[PDB]
Write a protein that holds these residues in place. Sequence first.
Motif, PDB file in Angstrom:
ATOM      1  N   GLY A   1      10.340 -20.786  -2.038  1.00  0.00           N
ATOM      2  CA  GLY A   1       9.090 -20.704  -1.302  1.00  0.00           C
ATOM      3  C   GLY A   1       7.886 -20.667  -2.212  1.00  0.00           C
ATOM      4  O   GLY A   1       6.763 -20.919  -1.777  1.00  0.00           O
ATOM      5  N   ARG A   2       8.124 -20.369  -3.486  1.00  0.00           N
ATOM      6  CA  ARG A   2       7.049 -20.166  -4.460  1.00  0.00           C
ATOM      7  C   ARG A   2       6.576 -21.496  -5.038  1.00  0.00           C
ATOM      8  O   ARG A   2       6.850 -21.842  -6.192  1.00  0.00           O
ATOM      9  N   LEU A   3       5.845 -22.234  -4.218  1.00  0.00           N
ATOM     10  CA  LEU A   3       5.493 -23.608  -4.521  1.00  0.00           C
ATOM     11  C   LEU A   3       4.426 -23.717  -5.601  1.00  0.00           C
ATOM     12  O   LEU A   3       4.482 -24.607  -6.445  1.00  0.00           O
TER      13      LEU A   3
ATOM     14  N   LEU B   1       4.861 -25.849  -8.998  1.00  0.00           N
ATOM     15  CA  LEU B   1       3.880 -26.835  -9.416  1.00  0.00           C
ATOM     16  C   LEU B   1       3.284 -26.531 -10.796  1.00  0.00           C
ATOM     17  O   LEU B   1       2.959 -27.443 -11.559  1.00  0.00           O
ATOM     18  N   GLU B   2       3.119 -25.254 -11.130  1.00  0.00           N
ATOM     19  CA  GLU B   2       2.632 -24.866 -12.457  1.00  0.00           C
ATOM     20  C   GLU B   2       3.589 -25.299 -13.567  1.00  0.00           C
ATOM     21  O   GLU B   2       3.182 -25.815 -14.623  1.00  0.00           O
ATOM     22  N   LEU B   3       4.877 -25.066 -13.337  1.00  0.00           N
ATOM     23  CA  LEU B   3       5.879 -25.426 -14.337  1.00  0.00           C
ATOM     24  C   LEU B   3       5.972 -26.942 -14.436  1.00  0.00           C
ATOM     25  O   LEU B   3       6.173 -27.497 -15.519  1.00  0.00           O
ATOM     26  N   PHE B   4       5.882 -27.606 -13.290  1.00  0.00           N
ATOM     27  CA  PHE B   4       5.839 -29.072 -13.259  1.00  0.00           C
ATOM     28  C   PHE B   4       4.708 -29.591 -14.157  1.00  0.00           C
ATOM     29  O   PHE B   4       4.905 -30.458 -15.020  1.00  0.00           O
TER      30      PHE B   4
ATOM     31  N   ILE C   1       7.990 -33.272 -21.700  1.00  0.00           N
ATOM     32  CA  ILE C   1       9.300 -33.325 -21.065  1.00  0.00           C
ATOM     33  C   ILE C   1       9.133 -34.144 -19.805  1.00  0.00           C
ATOM     34  O   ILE C   1       8.283 -33.853 -18.972  1.00  0.00           O
ATOM     35  N   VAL C   2       9.903 -35.211 -19.699  1.00  0.00           N
ATOM     36  CA  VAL C   2       9.730 -36.149 -18.611  1.00  0.00           C
ATOM     37  C   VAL C   2      10.482 -35.718 -17.365  1.00  0.00           C
ATOM     38  O   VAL C   2      11.699 -35.570 -17.408  1.00  0.00           O
TER      39      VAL C   2
ATOM     40  N   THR D   1      12.669 -32.063  -5.424  1.00  0.00           N
ATOM     41  CA  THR D   1      12.556 -30.649  -5.127  1.00  0.00           C
ATOM     42  C   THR D   1      11.141 -30.340  -4.708  1.00  0.00           C
ATOM     43  O   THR D   1      10.908 -29.666  -3.693  1.00  0.00           O
ATOM     44  N   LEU D   2      10.177 -30.844  -5.483  1.00  0.00           N
ATOM     45  CA  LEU D   2       8.786 -30.546  -5.184  1.00  0.00           C
ATOM     46  C   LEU D   2       8.339 -31.195  -3.883  1.00  0.00           C
ATOM     47  O   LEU D   2       7.661 -30.561  -3.059  1.00  0.00           O
TER      48      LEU D   2
END
Length: 175
Positions: free
Chosen positions: A1-3, A7-10, A18-19, A27-28
């Motif tokens: 649920g912690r979108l 998105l921050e890690l993305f 890192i591709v 997932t996102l």
Amino acid sequence: GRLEEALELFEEMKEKGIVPDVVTYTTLISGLGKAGRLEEALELFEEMKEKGIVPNVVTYNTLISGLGKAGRLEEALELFEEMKEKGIVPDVVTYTTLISGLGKAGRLEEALELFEEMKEKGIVPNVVTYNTLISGLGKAGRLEEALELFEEMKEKGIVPDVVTYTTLISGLGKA
Ligand SMILES: [Mg+2]
Ligand SMILES: [Mg+2]
Ligand SMILES: [Mg+2]
């Protein structure tokens, strides 16, 4: 649920060289979809295609479900045509969503055309598909065709439920 963290890690991984891959994007896009944030999911989908990451049936299903839910049928149909062009095979969920969406939009002749098509491709309709079409035909006074579909579903071993019967009984009664 912690979108917002995902998105921050993305964003972090992309900044570190890192591709991301099809799993990252899926997932996102799914999380964004479920969170109501459809426009952001669609932006990620555009981005993944620019990077050469190839979407798969799960990607398309999630977006089509989101667009269909939102009544954005013209765009859901664009994605459906795109996925078939890329040789990504739609499945029962894809068709159900479109037939449902076209259903709710009262575009019944198009829903019946997709229904025809799904059967040509070997996708097996389910009770949801049949219920939506029979409801739509029932409300339009197209009782004879609703009864043909009812006969067909039983023949295929799809078991009707109370809404199927209600719809037909209502038609036979008030028509
Ligand atoms: Mg867009
Ligand atoms: Mg587009
Ligand atoms: Mg297109």
